[PDB]
């Protein structure tokens, strides 16, 4: 044990994959680290705090499109931002659940301010620009949550009208990705509309 | 004890409110009913099955706009359908989590077939019509999940750029409802677009 925040979060990320969000505990975490449970406090207070750092960490590694490139349309940006957010959530077991209920923190202030200012100078009012953000985040979270639940819920469970069958089979056969890429693009047309004003 | 499925689900709905989704168990349920745990099996196999019935029940009571009224635009219908779905999820503690990962069941076949056929005769292809449905459901679920988590997550936790502050305060001050009504309406403009074809 070199004893590191970075090693704790690494190890916690692994443990999340092993047991998932409900089964994750600080007790189980220290044991995986081969340390006593008081020691691990020097890095995490408790489960919520641990979960906040896991959520933060998943963005650090995977949410790469947190920032607009100039010349890149706001439209492409809401697109690539949602994509990498999605990508962040999917990176681990219960990724979307680990994010749920988190809020902006100090180290995101600059990223997030830039995010609203980028939209604003495109001509969205601050209000619509923050609603453009929540619509995309709510929608993306909704997709990954359903998509992520699908598997554990299919484990624990065991004939119809032909259009419904066709619809389910089309839905089932096409991944989460198209269902995701589709709504994403409906939201972007709503916003292309709104902005025209 | 008259011993009823209807009484079990009533009582389970109550228990969900008391302890929430993770703390709900069949063990805790029978004890609330004043019965032994074998007895309660004659109505529910296990937690997943219980959760499926709770999810079903919340739609029965509250998801009233499951069906289009002719003369009612598809647009008004996707609107009122999302609204009452939302309404279903919010009706109980962890309502949105209880739905997560559920799938269409036999008694929904007629409702749901009608739902895709209604859109189809409006001129959506089956595929887009099922994507119009998932976009709205994913988005609605994403809203209520975040909205529902907000409170428990605020219990268990403890300064910034002024536009971010303004954005948070605007966001915070305006309920979940506007953030919800907004994305909903972006999705509907995307679909008003797509259909034009
Ligand atoms: C293909 N078909 C669209 C599927 C496929 C997988 C699914 O997991 C689901 C659907 C239909 C949708 C219908 C949506 C609908 N609406 C968009 C809210 C809806 O009215 C209902 C309902 N029972 O009225 C659903 O079951 C629903 O909430 C739902 O849970 C679905 C759902 O779980
Ligand atoms: C007002 N502002 C938009 C708020 C308010 C409450 C919130 O709970 C949140 C935001 C910003 C959004 C930004 C979205 C952004 N995007 C739409 C995916 C985003 O890029 C980030 C990010 N850190 O890059 C978020 O924090 C974000 O995922 C997020 O978690 C937010 C979030 O949790
Ligand atoms: Mg967030
Ligand atoms: Mg569903």
From Swiss-Prot, chains A, B:
Keywords: Antibiotic resistance, DNA-binding, Magnesium, Metal-binding, Repressor, Transcription, Transcription regulation, Transposable element. GO terms for molecular function: DNA-binding transcription factor activity; metal ion binding; transcription cis-regulatory region binding. Mg(2+) binds at residue 99. Residues 25-44 bind DNA. Residues 2-62 form the HTH tetR-type domain. Changing residue 81 to H: 100-fold reduction of affinity for tetracycline. Signal peptide: none annotated. It holds the Pfam family TetR_N. PROSITE patterns: HTH_TETR_1 (PS01081), HTH_TETR_2 (PS50977). InterPro entries: DNA-bd_HTH_TetR-type_CS (IPR023772), Homeodomain-like_sf (IPR009057), HTH-type_TetR-like_transc_reg (IPR050109), HTH_TetR (IPR001647), Repressor_TetR_C (IPR004111), Tet_transcr_reg_TetR (IPR003012), Tet_transcr_reg_TetR-rel_C_sf (IPR036271). SUPFAM superfamilies: Homeodomain-like, Tetracyclin repressor-like, C-terminal domain. One of its GO terms (biological process) is response to antibiotic. Tetracycline binds at residues 63, 81. Changing residue 102 to I: <10-fold reduction of affinity for tetracycline. TetR is the repressor of the tetracycline resistance element; its N-terminal region forms a helix-turn-helix structure and binds DNA. Binding of tetracycline to TetR reduces the repressor affinity for the tetracycline resistance gene (tetA) promoter operator sites. This is Tetracycline repressor protein class B from transposon Tn10. It comes from Escherichia coli. The lineage of its organism: Bacteria, Pseudomonadati, Pseudomonadota, Gammaproteobacteria, Enterobacterales. The gene is tetR.
């Amino acid at each position: 044990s070199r004893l590191d925040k970075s090693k704790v979060i690494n190890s916690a990320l692994e443990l999340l994959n092993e047991v998932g969000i409900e089964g994750l505990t600080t007790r189980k975490l220290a044991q995986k680290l081969g340390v006593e449970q008081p020691t691990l406090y020097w890095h995490v207070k408790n489960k919520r705090a641990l979960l906040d750092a896991l959520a933060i960490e998943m963005l650090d590694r995977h949410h790469t499109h947190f920032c607009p490139l100039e010349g890149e349309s706001w439209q492409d940006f809401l697109r690539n931002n949602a994509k990498s957010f999605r990508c962040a959530l999917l990176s681990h077991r219960d990724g979307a659940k680990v994010h749920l209920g988190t809020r902006p923190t100090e180290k995101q202030y600059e990223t997030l301010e830039n995010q609203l200012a980028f939209l604003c100078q495109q001509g969205f009012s601050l209000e619509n620009a923050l609603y453009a953000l929540s619509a995309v985040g709510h929608f993306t979270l909704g997709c990954v949550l359903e998509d992520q639940e699908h598997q554990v819920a299919k484990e624990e469970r065991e004939s119809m009208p032909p259009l419904l069958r066709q619809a389910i089979e089309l839905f089932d056969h096409q991944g989460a990705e198209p269902a995701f890429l589709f709504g994403l693009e409906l939201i972007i047309c709503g916003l292309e509309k709104q902005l025209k004003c």
